[PDB]
Amino acid sequence: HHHHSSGLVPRGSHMSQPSILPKPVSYTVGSGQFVLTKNASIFVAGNNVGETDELFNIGQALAKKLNASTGYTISVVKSNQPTAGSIYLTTVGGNAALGNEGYDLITTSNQVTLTANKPEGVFRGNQTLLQLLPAGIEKNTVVSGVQWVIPHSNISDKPEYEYRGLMLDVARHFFTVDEVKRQIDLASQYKINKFHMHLSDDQGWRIEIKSWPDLIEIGSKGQVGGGPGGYYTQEQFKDIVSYAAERYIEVIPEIDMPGHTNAALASYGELNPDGKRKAMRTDTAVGYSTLMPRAEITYQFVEDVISELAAISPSPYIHLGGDESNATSAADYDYFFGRVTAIANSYGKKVVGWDPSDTSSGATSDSVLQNWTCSASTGTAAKAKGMKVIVSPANAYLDMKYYSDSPIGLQWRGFVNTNRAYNWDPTDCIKGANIYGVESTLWTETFVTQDHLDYMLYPKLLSNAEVGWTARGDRNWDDFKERLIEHTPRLQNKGIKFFADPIV
């Protein structure tokens, strides 16, 4: 038998017909079609009144999306007696084998029925439903001249990995609450279920801490290249969390420590050995900054920050960073990370950290390693301690240029085009681990505008999202590539300023 790898498409990028991404466990199509008309309602039915009420909110979110493009006014009904032309969302009789996020979605001529185990699974199923309707459905304004049809079809689905996330760096360049909500919204449509916020680094501090107000008054006032920066009040952070919760997306806030701390060090002189504030940094160097690992003021600071963040962040996880502490000795890093893990745990939070944080003698088996290095020795500690691992290999570093000539992006992990972002498995990063899942990281050294985010995340994130959701045995670049071509108008319709990758 003959085999080959993909080259660039001759003559440039290529960028009744459903376009499901990520690929579901099974999808069959039969004869006939359902027609969504102006008289459609969404019916919801759970196993008890509380569950029905949650399904009602989900139904309303779906109706809002459908109404924007159809111009209809579909409303939602608490009833288990759907009428012909209805969409029906239910958790009654869900297939347990499909888990919390799984669903069956069966479309007949008279009715769409989505059956899940939990409301979360109805929400994930709804993302598929939107992809079964014609391109045009994802428009934010009314589309005319398109019959809103769904082929008679049968889908069963569930994720391969529990953790399927996106990180946005808002420290290097700041993005508004609206901009952050948009990226959360867009990612949710591809079944991303985790959003990691990199809230602080050398060039800026982005979260209001009432007990240390100069973190904002001084530490938020810049960014890479010297713009004005910005920050989130605690009320704004809560709003982001709430918006994410409506999409069954867990928000994990990161305060990076003991390295990548210049913004805090520039805000408070007492955090520095010489008692003087550091100058703010607007360059892109990494590795040089450190908290004082043997000063109690350091641990008081971390505790105040953790206390306030814990109060407003319902996720059971807090990310404490731990990458590139090149100005911290191995012994002091071990000690430091153990102390801050104890603080986090006392405030009811489990710690996530970049490698090599798993090597801290103060880590517990409840701690989580974010494995970005992906070397043979990375996560040896995590594995021995029974710590879950989230992988972020080169293929998940979405800030990497697509090609040598990309006008934005970095290249320290090589170039990562749409194909590279697809052709990998989490076990390529680490073997012998309990892999919790995958996280796409969008660092923002070189990204200033919303269009820059769109360009780098789309289509790269679609590739990563399928690696997280679809089983390895069912992943195939030739298949995905052709599906991606088909999906292109949907990206256009959503207003995503994607890169038309020539490998697609």
Ligand SMILES: CC(=O)N[C@H]1/C(=N/OC(=O)Nc2ccccc2)O[C@H](CO)[C@@H](O)[C@@H]1O
């Ligand atoms: C965990 C992580 O990725 N840390 C830093 C980081 N790690 O940086 C490198 O080590 N870059 C580098 C390594 C060797 C040679 C040249 C650059 O990469 C990101 C950008 O992709 C930065 O935004 C992060 O702060």
